[PDB]
Design a protein around this ligand. Structure first.
Ligand SMILES: *[B]([O])([O])[C]([N]C(=O)[C]C1=[C][C]=[C]S1)C1=[C][C]=[C][C]=[C]1
Ligand SMILES: [K+]
Length: 358
């Protein structure tokens, strides 16, 4: 690999791993479009299995970028419109607070304060309808952003209804297969278990547990090679041959709302580049505090801006992931770890590496 990439990655990541006591980590840097891979430590401490380029990590909320793109692909196919009220796809949601809440609001966390998590007690289709019917918004739609699994998760489930496919089947056939993400899974098959890393929380080996809207909000597992390909695909959508998927990727990076320095896409979040890490932390869900932020509508949405820091953080109980890329520099990074460590440390490391290579 080019020595400049080797050096900045190792000099940045080694201290990160030591400081955060991460058991295993994989990193990919996409430079001028080509991927370069790095791995450290262990996928399974007890069984002494090393992290490799084939190790599967839980992406946590980075899964929302796949949900946003799959929804963009459905818009491009003419199956749904973001301006469509939620009730068009779920007539059974008769409670009055749903009047005026559109798919756009679900996809961008602006429905009026849907909760951060779907409760563990929600286990059936009937339980989920009850949950949404009983939810009382704190705000009118389209006024404040409150990051939430229950918002984009519902968007994902509804976006695939016209297709006649399950969410998993739609993701596989419309996003994973065309992009050749052949080791990316919503459900890890038994054949792939040998590469599935364990996550570590308080020193115990753990995997994410089943939950309502898990696939849609935080349930993808992938390797560092497939994630590098996902970044490549989002950096250069015009190279994608499937027309609706190319258009869907473009729609997911459009700018729909602004709050401070951040712009909300579908799954992806963006800031104008150049920008420093402190502003990225304060202008993203990477900050430690859970925040209600008033938003300004971008009417109409701005098409994907090349000079942007486009990114997404993700976590499960035992994993911490981060993806960031800058289209105009053809530069990106993926960091996958089997410990959920502080988001600010992820941003600091990613920025140190990309700033050195831009
Ligand atoms: B995402 O922002 O990473 C999201 N992830 C999950 O809900 C998956 C988890 C299962 C157990 C712990 S995290 C997230 C939303 C809200 C709080 C933390 C992470
Ligand atoms: K589920």
């Amino acid at each position: 690999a080019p020595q400049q990439i080797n050096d900045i990655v190792h000099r940045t990541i080694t201290p990160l791993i030591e400081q955060q006591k991460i058991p295993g980590m994989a990193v990919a840097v996409i430079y001028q479009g080509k991927p370069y891979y790095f791995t450290w430590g262990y996928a399974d401490i007890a069984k002494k299995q090393p992290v490799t380029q084939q190790t599967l990590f839980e992406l946590g909320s980075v899964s929302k970028t796949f949900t946003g793109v799959l929804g963009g692909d459905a818009i491009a196919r003419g199956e749904i419109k973001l301006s469509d009220p939620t009730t068009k796809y779920w007539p059974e949601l008769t409670a009055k607070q749903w009047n005026g809440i559109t798919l756009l609001h679900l996809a961008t966390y602006t429905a009026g304060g849907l909760p951060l998590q779907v409760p563990d007690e929600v286990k059936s289709s009937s339980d989920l309808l009850r949950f949404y019917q009983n939810w009382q918004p704190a705000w009118a739609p389209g006024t404040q952003r409150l990051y939430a699994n229950s918002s984009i998760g519902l968007f994902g489930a509804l976006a695939v209804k016209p297709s006649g496919l399950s969410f998993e089947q739609a993701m596989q056939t419309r996003v994973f297969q065309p992009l050749k993400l052949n080791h990316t899974w919503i459900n890890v098959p038994p054949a792939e278990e040998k590469n599935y890393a364990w996550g570590y929380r308080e020193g115990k080996a753990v995997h994410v547990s089943p939950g309502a809207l898990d696939a849609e909000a935080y349930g993808v597992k992938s390797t560092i090679e497939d994630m590098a390909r996902w970044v490549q695909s989002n950096l250069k959508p015009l190279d994608i041959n499937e027309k609706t998927l190319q258009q869907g990727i473009q729609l997911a990076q459009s700018r729909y709302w602004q709050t401070g320095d951040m712009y909300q896409g579908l799954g992806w979040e963006m800031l104008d580049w150049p920008v420093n890490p402190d502003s990225i932390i304060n202008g993203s869900d990477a900050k430690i505090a859970l925040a209600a932020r008033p938003v300004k509508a971008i009417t109409p949405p701005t098409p994907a801006v090349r000079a942007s820091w486009v990114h997404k953080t993700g976590a499960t109980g035992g994993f911490g992931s981060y993806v960031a890329f800058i289209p105009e520099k053809e530069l990106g990074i993926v960091m996958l770890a089997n410990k959920n460590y502080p988001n600010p440390a992820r941003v600091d490391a990613a920025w140190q590496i990309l700033n050195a290579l831009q």
